[PDB]
Amino acid sequence: GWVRPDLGELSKVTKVKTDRPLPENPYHSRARPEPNPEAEGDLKPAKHGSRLFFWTM
């Protein structure tokens, strides 16, 4: 009683019932380094301007 599969049936993506636990870290990755402080705040004018040599602005 074997019915031969039709065209494009064995290439389907199918689902599997498994009790094997999902590997939580399959890549064996380390801990990612902490990001940069990403500072945030409100802009204010430069203190005494450019402060380049004799320029007052």
Ligand X SMILES: CCCCCCCCCCCCCCCCCC(=O)OC[C@H](COP(=O)([O-])OCC(O)COP(=O)([O-])OC[C@@H](COC(=O)CCCCCCCCCCCCCCCCC)OC(=O)CCCCCCCCCCCCCCCCC)OC(=O)CCCCCCCCCCCCCCCCC
| Contacts with other proteins, residue ranges (CB under 8 A) | 36-37, 39, 47-48, 51
46, 52 contact by CB (below 8 A): no
- Minimum CB separation of residue 43 from ligand X in Å reads 20
Binding mask 15-54 for ligand X (x = CB under 6 A): ---------------------------------------x
| Token pair of 24 as six digits | 């939580």
Residue 55 binds to ligand X (criterion: CB under 6 A)? yes
From the list ligand X, other proteins, none, which binds 37 (C-beta under 5 to 8 Å, kind-based)?
other proteins
C-alpha to C-alpha distance for 44 and 47, rounded to whole angstroms = 9
Give phi and psi for 18, each to the nearest 5.
-135, 145
Question: Which amino acid type is present at position 11?
Answer: S
